[PDB]
Amino acid sequence: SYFPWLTILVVLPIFAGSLIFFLPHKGNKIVRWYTISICLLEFLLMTYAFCYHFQLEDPLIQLKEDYKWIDVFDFHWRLGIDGLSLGSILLTGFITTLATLAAWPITRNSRLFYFLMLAMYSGQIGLFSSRDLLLFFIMWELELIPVYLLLSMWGGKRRLYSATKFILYTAGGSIFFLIGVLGMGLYGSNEPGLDLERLINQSYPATLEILLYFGFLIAYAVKLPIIPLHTWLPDTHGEAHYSTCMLLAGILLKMGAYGLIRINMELLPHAHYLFSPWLVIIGAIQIIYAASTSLGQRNFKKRIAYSSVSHMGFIIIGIGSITNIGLNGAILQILSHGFIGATLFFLAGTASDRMRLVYLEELGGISIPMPKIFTMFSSFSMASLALPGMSGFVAELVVFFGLITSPKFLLMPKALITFVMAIGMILTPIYLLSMLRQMFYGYKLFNVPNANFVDSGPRELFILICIFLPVIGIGIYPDFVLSLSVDRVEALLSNYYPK
Amino acid sequence: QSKVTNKVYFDINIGNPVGKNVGRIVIGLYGDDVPQTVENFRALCTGEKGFGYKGSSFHRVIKDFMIQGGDFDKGNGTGGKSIYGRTFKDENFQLVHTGPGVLSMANAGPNTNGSQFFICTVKTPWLDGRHVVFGQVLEGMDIVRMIESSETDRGDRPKKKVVISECGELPV
Amino acid sequence: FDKGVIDGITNGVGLASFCIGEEIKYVGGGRISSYLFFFLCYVSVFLF
Amino acid sequence: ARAALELHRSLCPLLVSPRELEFLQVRDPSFCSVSMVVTQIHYTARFPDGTVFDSSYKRGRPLTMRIGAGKILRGLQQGIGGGGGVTPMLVGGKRKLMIPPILAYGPEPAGCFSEAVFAQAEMNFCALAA
Amino acid sequence: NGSFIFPECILIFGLILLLMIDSTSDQKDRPWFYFISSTSLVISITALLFRWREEPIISFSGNFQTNNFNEIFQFLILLCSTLCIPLSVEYIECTEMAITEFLLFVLTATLGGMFLCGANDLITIFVAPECFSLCSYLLSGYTKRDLRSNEATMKYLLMGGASSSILVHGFSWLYGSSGGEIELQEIVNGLINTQMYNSPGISIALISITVGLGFKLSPAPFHQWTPDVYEGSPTPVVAFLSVTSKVAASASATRILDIPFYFSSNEWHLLLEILAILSMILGNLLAITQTSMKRMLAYSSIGQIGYVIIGIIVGDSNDGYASMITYMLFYISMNLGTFACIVLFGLRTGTDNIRDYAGLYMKDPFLALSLALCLLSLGGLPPLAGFFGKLYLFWCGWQAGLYFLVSIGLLTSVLSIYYYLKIIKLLMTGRNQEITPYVRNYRRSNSIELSMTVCVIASTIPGISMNPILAIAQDTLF
């Protein structure tokens, strides 16, 4: 147990990828295998740590440890896994391994690329496993350069504008986060202060709770797209290589929700309990606004980006409406979206690069040359339609149940908000099938020449199937992802004071 | 010691971007033998056009001697005022300094009382004859001593800011 | 009311800098007499 | 300009001993003398009766001067480094003085469009070395 | 009869030797003095190593200084000169100019800067800025056949004369109002026995001093002279100035403003703030629109970065000076790295404008990487050193109450990220038909390599190893 796992689990990828540099061997071949082996080793170590070294029955922290790092402003190597973290950690390992696999036929650089992939890997796990607030911030901003390089080196026509908007926007958003760090770091620094575990008992005065709450909420709304702060997403998604975009719109977005769950609802209750209803309202109007603007777009990559935007309203409404299941249904939702959005962007980037046409009007009948892409695309479109069976349904269902049985509401908005939320089910197929019909159905020209038109080979097909099967497995019996008993203590603080 | 008329409560906050609460002080005001000065204090501690102690500090903490505060203007001692203009003369010298915990309007030469008050963490018999007495602490002596034992720079200020978050009147 | 409004704002916050920089960059511009003049103006006004 | 506000105590002394030139009074001698070198003291100057016009505590570090070469009021240099018939103040000592107006600025003030010292005054000090 | 000048007497010895060898020797000098001067510098550094953990003992008849804090800067300037000379050897070598008196000028300017770090005399602290400025109009114009190197002597000499004039006039006003006094410590006495302190006067001798100070380290309202000279003078002297001038000026400013200005705090704390809030804004906006490398560096690395150093001088209760020392130690390295890379690439190609750095990653990747590292560090990204510098500068400075200076600092840092990432993007590219025929003919490949590689890892390691540096920088009382 004291043999450190999380330290290894964080310093393995970047270290074992630093050997790609100073290795003159080839152009592209050996690096792919040397990276996929490291990724598989890391994932196996992750699942070994989870299986026989975790309990699911105690809401404390597990596998924790700490050291002394800078010691002036108390900032340690404090690190520990917990219930909320575990799901996102496993999902990150899984989807990033599969993204690195999907990035197989890249020979442009193929040495900086896989190393940057491993760096983003290590950074994501570092954030998701953090236990010291400043270290959480460090892991947050560590990934900001690798993603910029992956954008500006590979992907899309207008890569530059998208990349620079994304980097400037995210770096600016993190400023309010650093403001909150400086705010609650100096608040009695003799009491540990920078130990995210020992902050549960902090009793801050009024008019300061609100400022720290907002300093974190602004940064989160920057990372996790909230309506007035979403303009950056369509550009940095419609221009990214599908290999990047898989992990980008499947993990990096969910950090904005994991942080909001971990440092807002757990640390600043009376700063969050007096601000939950507006969060709920914003999420409710987002669910419909994102879809109503998705239907308007004309290049299917941006349409997929907006569909990813829309489902981020269920997470919001689950963070508000303070219940056990409303918070708990949010986690299942971030998992069942990290699957679906990632797979849909992979399919969009794989259909494209075969047709070299981005505007959804000229896409002929692609069903005739390549059937398997059509099948695995319609399947995940159905998944994104919140169709039952697949995991896109039970998440939204539990979100509804959390809102309905919420205690901080009395039947007036508890129904109108449910109504405006259910309009999403009428609205989403209108823009998903409108793409499925223009780009796949109909009989285009006699596209008989089997050139620049080949169905998915073994690698892409296996990736699709191996991401698909978890969706069914979760949507049939959704207690594989309800192994969360921290909410029974996470929603314990809030539940009696005023109002 | 004499009769008590009003009871005033003070908050105490330390930390130096902002002050976390540490406790609460409760003091009595002898409105029976020094009415004008006691009324000045009690009015400052509540409101009445904003000239109050809400957001003041203790800008001089002499260990084993005293703690002075009430400069809601400059935080340096060269500020602060009172309701009856800016200063007024001494009122009376009936009540005398006795022991741990008294209140005295920290003057700047006789007949020049102002906003600066100070509490005596120790016995001061020598001081009497030229300083007013209008209050003793009734609850919070330990917090007063904790403030008195705070760290001080060369200017005898506290190195951690010691502000008063909220101040008011709490009747019997 | 998405591209024309909030995209307009998130660009004009990054576009107004592109204009202000070059705008305030084209005052003075050599002519050491102008340098000394603008150096004296601030010294003089700061005396208040 | 003229007098401003302050606040302090005085730690009431014994009776002063004039010693034929000034007004001397001792409160606490502690450690060791000081030669004709730079010193660092803390003062709090009064008017003859009650008023206070400056105090080293009203700023940051208490000011630093030269005890031994004429750069200060003759009264002080007589009552800190030790004058004829008076023992010098120790390193951590503490004394109290009443300066007659011949060992002081004398019978003319220091004007700044308003004399910052009453013309022909004679002030008090509570000098504590450091 | 005193060893507190021996750290400078060694430098004087080396100066006399460097002047003698050209008078006596014939031609064996070119690679000989190149290391003989480094011997004098390292010997002076070893001499300064002795006086670590020493007393605040006063100087010759109480003239310049000898304490711990001043000794830190006295060593730091030596560090700058040691790193800078190998740069300003080969550059002037490949111009067919006389090299002896160039090294003599650099040595004498370093001597002036070293003496300035003390100088609690009101006269020494006037001659020493001249000993550092009189040896500056020469270097900043020491390419006579060029044309720009004359403009960046006219609009440097005129400015540095006017400013030193204003400063010495403020000094004269102080000497007057102070009843007659020079010794820096002995002013708050003498400004009291003469009761003319709280009066007008002092209020004038404060501004007429702060302005002359600002000009020497160029905040925004007086930055006018810096962008031009840094483009007109040779790049090595640009680096030498942009490191040691700032170090010496910031070492003199804190002492000249903290020792004799106890009382006027609330009236200069504000003043410096007005500079900082401007310095970190006007020094960034223009930095965006630049196309020349030296001028963009002048804007960003000086016009701005001289902001957060000051960002604690206002908010200082002696709990912050450690953070200033640490940030200076970070800035010296994170600036000399990029200047070494720029000198190397410019010499190897023959251009300065930004649009020629394209494709440099493919031709020679080591130089591109060691330049990107320093540039990103200047940007202040977490794992690097500039991040921790700015961080510990804010964390002590938000801990001191003032709020409308940290927010502006973070915001302008985010803004500054732009041009750094712009040039970085211009490095990584492979569009063969875009790269100009400058990087296309680049025979890729001692001194400059060594300096660049030992100066760039100090821009990544200390940001993570700042624990002993911090523990060392806390013992400063001045």
Side-chain angles (χ1 to χ4, degrees), chain A residues 1-25 27-28 31-73 75-108 110-119 121-126 128-131 133-190 192-208 210-229 231-234 236-266 268-314 316-349 351-367 369-393 395-443 445 448-449 451 453-454 456-485 487 489-496 498, chain B residues 1-45 47 50 52-75 77-86 88-120 122 124-147 149-172, chain C residues 1-10 12-48, chain D residues 1-6 10 12-13 15-18 21-22 24-26 28-41 44-60 62-66 68-77 79-86 88-89 92-94 97-114 116-117 119-127 129-130, chain E residues 1-33 35-52 54-94 96-147 149-150 152-154 156-158 160-195 197-279 281-306 308-311 313-347 349-409 411 413-443 446-477:
Chain A
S1 161
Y2 65 97
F3 182 76
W5 303 91
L6 282 151
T7 314
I8 294 185
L9 263 191
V10 170
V11 312
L12 193 60
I14 187 54
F15 179 91
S18 178
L19 267 71
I20 280 178
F21 279 148
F22 313 138
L23 181 67
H25 205 273
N28 173 54
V31 192
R32 324 188 306 197
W33 293 106
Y34 172 74
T35 300
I36 200 67
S37 67
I38 283 300
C39 281
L40 270 297
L41 279 188
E42 167 90 338
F43 178 46
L44 264 188
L45 201 151
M46 281 170 55
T47 196
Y48 182 80
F50 154 67
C51 59
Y52 315 139
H53 288 337
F54 202 62
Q55 295 318 111
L56 322 175
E57 207 80 357
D58 270 323
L60 295 175
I61 320 164
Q62 300 284 331
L63 317 180
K64 82 193 61 196
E65 77 273 15
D66 44 351
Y67 298 112
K68 291 294 144 279
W69 194 257
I70 305 302
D71 201 23
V72 160
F73 54 95
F75 154 64
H76 312 143
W77 194 233
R78 187 56 208 270
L79 203 72
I81 191 180
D82 206 327
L84 302 147
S85 62
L86 165 68
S88 279
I89 297 181
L90 287 185
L91 173 55
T92 290
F94 184 73
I95 196 65
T96 309
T97 295
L98 283 175
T100 301
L101 171 57
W104 201 255
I106 287 309
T107 70
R108 186 69 253 179
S110 69
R111 302 172 106 259
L112 174 82
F113 175 58
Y114 292 153
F115 171 76
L116 276 176
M117 198 63 74
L118 276 151
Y121 197 117
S122 189
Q124 294 155 302
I125 291 185
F128 278 128
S129 65
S130 83
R131 195 39 75 159
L133 192 150
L134 197 91
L135 171 69
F136 177 89
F137 172 60
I138 294 318
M139 290 308 192
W140 172 289
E141 265 172 18
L142 175 139
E143 54 85 17
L144 185 58
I145 283 303
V147 54
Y148 173 87
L149 291 182
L150 302 157
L151 269 294
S152 202
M153 284 306 300
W154 307 273
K157 170 196 203 302
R158 48 165 210 165
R159 70 181 74 90
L160 307 178
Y161 167 84
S162 44
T164 179
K165 152 186 289 164
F166 157 75
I167 181 171
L168 280 197
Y169 183 78
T170 294
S174 88
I175 288 308
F176 299 85
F177 190 93
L178 196 42
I179 285 308
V181 182
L182 300 183
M184 71 165 61
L186 300 172
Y187 189 99
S189 159
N190 50 5
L194 261 67
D195 271 332
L196 194 56
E197 162 63 16
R198 313 193 48 179
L199 291 175
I200 310 312
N201 320 330
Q202 269 313 94
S203 309
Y204 305 103
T207 200
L208 181 137
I210 296 190
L211 303 176
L212 307 188
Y213 195 59
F214 272 55
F216 292 151
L217 167 77
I218 292 307
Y220 284 152
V222 166
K223 199 41 165 284
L224 174 147
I226 295 177
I227 308 192
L229 272 60
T231 318
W232 63 287
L233 211 62
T236 182
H237 279 179
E239 296 320 303
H241 191 199
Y242 52 83
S243 46
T244 284
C245 177
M246 277 173 61
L247 68 98
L248 196 152
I251 292 303
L252 261 59
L253 288 191
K254 303 319 179 329
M255 273 146 60
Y258 165 78
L260 203 155
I261 275 170
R262 180 169 272 287
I263 71 165
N264 276 20
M265 271 202 76
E266 189 190 0
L268 315 181
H270 40 258
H272 170 100
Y273 165 66
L274 296 199
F275 204 61
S276 316
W278 301 100
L279 262 172
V280 167
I281 299 277
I282 281 297
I285 57 184
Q286 184 186 248
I287 294 185
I288 183 182
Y289 171 82
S292 184
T293 186
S294 191
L295 177 51
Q297 292 279 24
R298 215 172 50 92
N299 48 341
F300 54 102
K301 299 188 61 82
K302 305 193 165 31
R303 206 184 273 235
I304 300 305
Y306 279 158
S307 48
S308 178
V309 174
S310 185
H311 309 334
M312 311 299 294
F314 294 132
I316 294 316
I317 299 164
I319 288 172
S321 55
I322 301 167
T323 61
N324 287 341
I325 58 171
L327 196 146
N328 206 349
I331 283 149
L332 158 61
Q333 158 74 10
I334 77 176
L335 268 75
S336 168
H337 178 232
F339 284 145
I340 297 308
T343 321
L344 264 183
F345 284 109
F346 181 41
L347 271 173
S352 159
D353 162 83
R354 287 212 184 72
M355 298 165 297
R356 314 188 185 148
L357 280 193
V358 58
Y359 286 141
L360 202 54
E361 324 286 10
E362 299 81 24
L363 278 300
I366 322 300
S367 71
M370 45 181 71
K372 301 175 205 177
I373 292 187
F374 187 26
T375 293
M376 289 317 289
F377 200 97
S378 189
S379 158
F380 276 99
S381 277
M382 291 324 195
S384 178
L385 290 183
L387 200 84
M390 298 171 172
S391 195
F393 170 53
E396 161 266 348
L397 193 49
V398 178
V399 165
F400 281 171
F401 274 10
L403 173 67
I404 284 304
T405 67
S406 178
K408 196 202 160 56
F409 286 109
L410 51 92
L411 187 57
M412 194 43 211
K414 196 189 273 278
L416 200 147
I417 287 306
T418 294
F419 176 92
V420 178
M421 210 175 314
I423 312 289
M425 300 180 328
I426 298 190
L427 199 55
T428 317
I430 301 192
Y431 78 79
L432 274 197
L433 307 154
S434 302
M435 161 182 61
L436 290 174
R437 166 189 71 105
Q438 301 209 339
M439 78 178 289
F440 273 134
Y441 295 127
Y443 184 60
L445 70 89
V448 75
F453 272 108
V454 168
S456 295
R459 178 188 38 93
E460 308 145 347
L461 191 41
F462 165 70
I463 286 186
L464 287 176
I465 286 191
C466 194
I467 303 176
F468 184 46
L469 276 190
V471 170
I472 288 171
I474 293 187
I476 283 180
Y477 177 42
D479 201 24
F480 305 113
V481 299
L482 293 195
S483 74
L484 272 297
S485 178
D487 303 354
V489 176
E490 171 68 48
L492 161 62
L493 291 73
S494 290
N495 201 4
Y496 37 90
Chain B
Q1 280 215 42
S2 67
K3 272 175 180 159
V4 182
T5 57
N6 314 332
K7 306 183 154 208
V8 174
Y9 74 90
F10 276 126
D11 296 339
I12 286 300
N13 301 66
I14 63 169
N16 210 351
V18 282
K20 84 171 314 175
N21 190 346
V22 178
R24 163 82 77 93
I25 312 178
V26 161
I27 311 164
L29 304 195
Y30 317 93
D32 285 328
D33 292 272
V34 283
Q36 178 191 334
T37 295
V38 156
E39 189 275 323
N40 178 31
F41 197 70
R42 189 225 57 72
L44 292 204
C45 289
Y53 295 169
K54 174 175 191 56
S56 178
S57 44
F58 275 47
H59 55 252
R60 179 143 178 217
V61 190
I62 308 194
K63 155 161 185 162
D64 201 73
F65 207 100
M66 59 88 76
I67 59 188
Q68 153 168 335
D71 176 22
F72 58 90
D73 198 354
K74 311 281 210 176
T78 185
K81 65 179 68 182
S82 314
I83 46 177
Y84 302 104
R86 79 168 293 104
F88 41 91
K89 66 180 72 65
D90 285 343
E91 196 63 32
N92 199 327
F93 301 80
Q94 300 294 150
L95 297 199
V96 291
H97 300 71
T98 61
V102 288
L103 264 68
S104 309
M105 302 291 287
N107 56 6
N111 275 14
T112 322
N113 319 126
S115 196
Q116 314 197 75
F117 78 98
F118 76 91
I119 317 165
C120 276
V122 300
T124 77
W126 71 88
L127 183 71
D128 215 319
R130 54 188 172 177
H131 268 176
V132 184
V133 175
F134 71 103
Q136 298 160 36
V137 307
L138 312 158
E139 284 167 352
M141 289 151 160
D142 293 332
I143 290 312
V144 169
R145 298 204 207 284
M146 179 47 223
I147 301 186
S149 306
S150 163
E151 190 150 68
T152 44
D153 57 335
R154 316 170 315 287
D156 264 330
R157 283 201 179 93
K159 188 182 286 185
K160 304 189 184 184
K161 196 187 289 181
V162 188
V163 285
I164 291 189
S165 87
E166 183 55 40
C167 62
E169 188 176 12
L170 183 48
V172 193
Chain C
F1 288 178
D2 183 76
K3 299 181 319 174
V5 168
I6 72 169
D7 209 6
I9 289 316
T10 184
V13 65
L15 188 48
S17 179
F18 272 121
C19 181
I20 280 293
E22 269 298 305
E23 160 164 321
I24 77 160
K25 206 197 144 194
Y26 270 28
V27 298
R31 275 95 167 288
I32 312 98
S33 314
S34 52
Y35 280 169
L36 281 159
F37 176 40
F38 281 101
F39 160 86
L40 207 174
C41 310
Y42 301 139
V43 167
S44 88
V45 60
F46 263 114
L47 282 198
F48 297 162
Chain D
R2 287 211 47 168
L5 280 74
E6 196 60 18
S10 183
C12 202
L15 167 57
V16 293
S17 88
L21 274 301
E22 62 173 326
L24 163 72
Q25 152 78 44
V26 186
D28 270 327
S30 180
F31 278 162
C32 72
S33 166
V34 163
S35 163
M36 293 201 180
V37 78
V38 173
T39 183
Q40 176 166 345
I41 67 166
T44 311
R46 268 73 166 267
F47 271 169
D49 189 285
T51 314
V52 162
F53 58 82
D54 62 355
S55 71
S56 298
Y57 300 149
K58 208 187 74 171
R59 309 190 222 90
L63 78 163
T64 76
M65 69 186 186
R66 258 186 204 281
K71 290 281 98 175
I72 51 173
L73 276 299
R74 276 195 279 125
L76 301 201
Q77 195 188 255
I80 278 173
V86 175
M89 300 325 160
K94 181 164 152 190
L97 292 151
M98 154 190 289
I99 287 303
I102 184 59
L103 311 172
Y105 296 126
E108 69 282 339
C112 78
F113 187 75
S114 181
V117 165
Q120 201 263 309
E122 51 100 10
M123 70 290 291
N124 288 340
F125 277 79
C126 297
Chain E
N1 204 350
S3 174
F4 296 150
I5 319 296
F6 283 6
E8 277 84 339
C9 309
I10 284 147
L11 199 61
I12 295 152
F13 289 0
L15 184 157
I16 286 146
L17 299 197
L18 177 57
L19 187 43
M20 157 265 281
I21 54 149
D22 200 2
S23 315
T24 182
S25 86
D26 45 307
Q27 279 309 132
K28 59 94 176 178
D29 305 332
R30 309 185 72 87
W32 183 89
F33 59 68
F35 191 75
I36 295 300
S37 81
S38 315
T39 72
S40 278
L41 279 185
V42 299
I43 283 181
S44 200
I45 288 191
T46 58
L48 274 194
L49 289 182
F50 277 59
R51 297 279 76 79
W52 264 355
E54 201 56 34
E55 314 304 319
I57 178 60
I58 322 296
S59 315
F60 286 168
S61 297
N63 277 341
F64 76 113
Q65 193 62 48
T66 297
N67 66 12
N68 215 358
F69 164 88
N70 168 36
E71 178 259 313
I72 306 178
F73 278 118
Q74 281 211 5
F75 154 84
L76 219 56
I77 280 186
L78 278 183
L79 175 68
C80 315
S81 275
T82 57
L83 273 70
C84 173
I85 278 184
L87 279 73
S88 87
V89 166
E90 297 295 334
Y91 190 86
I92 68 168
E93 173 75 30
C94 179
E96 218 54 33
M97 299 274 272
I99 297 169
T100 318
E101 68 262 17
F102 181 97
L103 273 298
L104 160 69
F105 284 171
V106 161
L107 207 71
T108 297
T110 293
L111 183 143
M114 272 185 77
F115 273 129
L116 171 56
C117 275
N120 69 344
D121 208 359
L122 202 58
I123 288 181
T124 307
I125 197 158
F126 163 68
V127 169
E130 305 324 292
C131 201
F132 176 69
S133 179
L134 270 299
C135 315
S136 161
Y137 320 119
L138 278 296
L139 295 161
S140 160
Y142 185 35
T143 55
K144 54 187 76 66
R145 312 313 283 275
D146 181 85
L147 188 48
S149 159
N150 319 127
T153 314
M154 271 94 66
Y156 192 16
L157 172 73
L158 263 48
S163 184
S164 303
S165 173
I166 276 175
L167 165 68
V168 70
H169 189 101
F171 277 165
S172 66
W173 264 126
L174 194 70
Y175 171 47
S177 292
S178 177
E181 270 317 316
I182 47 167
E183 204 175 358
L184 216 60
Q185 280 93 351
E186 198 164 355
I187 282 180
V188 297
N189 167 33
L191 209 43
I192 286 307
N193 84 331
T194 286
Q195 285 277 114
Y197 68 111
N198 56 60
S199 155
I202 301 300
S203 64
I204 287 309
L206 171 63
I207 308 175
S208 290
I209 279 182
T210 314
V211 159
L213 267 194
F215 168 92
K216 297 299 189 179
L217 58 88
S218 47
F222 316 96
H223 73 254
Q224 288 279 9
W225 67 275
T226 290
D228 297 16
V229 54
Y230 283 25
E231 180 182 359
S233 64
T235 319
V237 67
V238 186
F240 158 84
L241 290 197
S242 170
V243 303
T244 190
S245 66
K246 291 325 168 307
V247 167
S250 174
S252 196
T254 183
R255 194 215 289 285
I256 195 167
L257 275 190
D258 176 89
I259 291 294
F261 279 90
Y262 287 134
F263 38 88
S264 294
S265 46
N266 50 3
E267 269 286 356
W268 65 263
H269 269 169
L270 174 64
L271 172 63
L272 280 176
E273 163 169 344
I274 306 192
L275 296 201
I277 286 307
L278 298 180
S279 200
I281 292 190
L282 276 77
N284 261 315
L285 293 182
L286 315 162
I288 279 183
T289 65
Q290 279 323 291
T291 64
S292 179
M293 179 68 52
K294 298 189 301 214
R295 186 173 175 89
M296 190 200 78
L297 266 190
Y299 280 159
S300 178
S301 41
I302 303 90
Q304 170 211 311
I305 299 193
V308 66
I309 313 157
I310 290 303
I313 281 185
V314 57
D316 182 77
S317 84
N318 264 288
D319 48 336
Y321 281 155
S323 80
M324 192 158 56
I325 304 312
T326 53
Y327 188 63
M328 288 324 287
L329 189 41
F330 288 164
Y331 165 68
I332 281 167
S333 75
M334 69 208 292
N335 203 54
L336 286 185
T338 180
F339 276 100
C341 299
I342 286 309
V343 170
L344 196 41
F345 163 77
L347 275 169
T349 313
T351 175
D352 186 25
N353 42 4
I354 280 183
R355 67 197 190 202
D356 296 354
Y357 293 81
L360 195 42
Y361 175 50
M362 198 65 257
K363 281 306 293 181
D364 196 350
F366 199 105
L367 186 137
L369 198 55
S370 178
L371 168 62
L373 260 176
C374 276
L375 274 172
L376 289 189
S377 181
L378 273 192
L381 287 158
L384 309 179
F387 173 88
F388 284 72
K390 289 180 184 181
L391 177 64
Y392 187 48
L393 273 190
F394 293 153
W395 193 84
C396 177
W398 186 281
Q399 205 259 349
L402 70 160
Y403 297 130
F404 185 49
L405 193 148
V406 160
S407 88
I408 289 295
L411 186 134
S413 88
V414 157
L415 176 50
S416 67
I417 309 191
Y418 175 79
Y419 41 75
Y420 296 138
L421 272 291
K422 164 177 57 161
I423 178 57
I424 291 319
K425 146 188 69 183
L426 270 156
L427 268 69
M428 319 292 185
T429 181
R431 301 193 34 79
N432 193 0
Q433 78 101 16
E434 177 164 19
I435 51 179
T436 74
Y438 272 56
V439 69
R440 190 169 259 110
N441 312 332
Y442 182 97
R443 172 167 78 266
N446 259 340
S447 154
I448 295 169
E449 292 87 4
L450 295 201
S451 178
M452 156 190 51
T453 182
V454 310
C455 175
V456 67
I457 80 172
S459 159
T460 298
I461 301 305
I464 302 168
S465 159
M466 83 199 302
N467 203 37
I469 304 194
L470 279 179
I472 276 172
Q474 298 266 339
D475 298 354
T476 77
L477 270 302

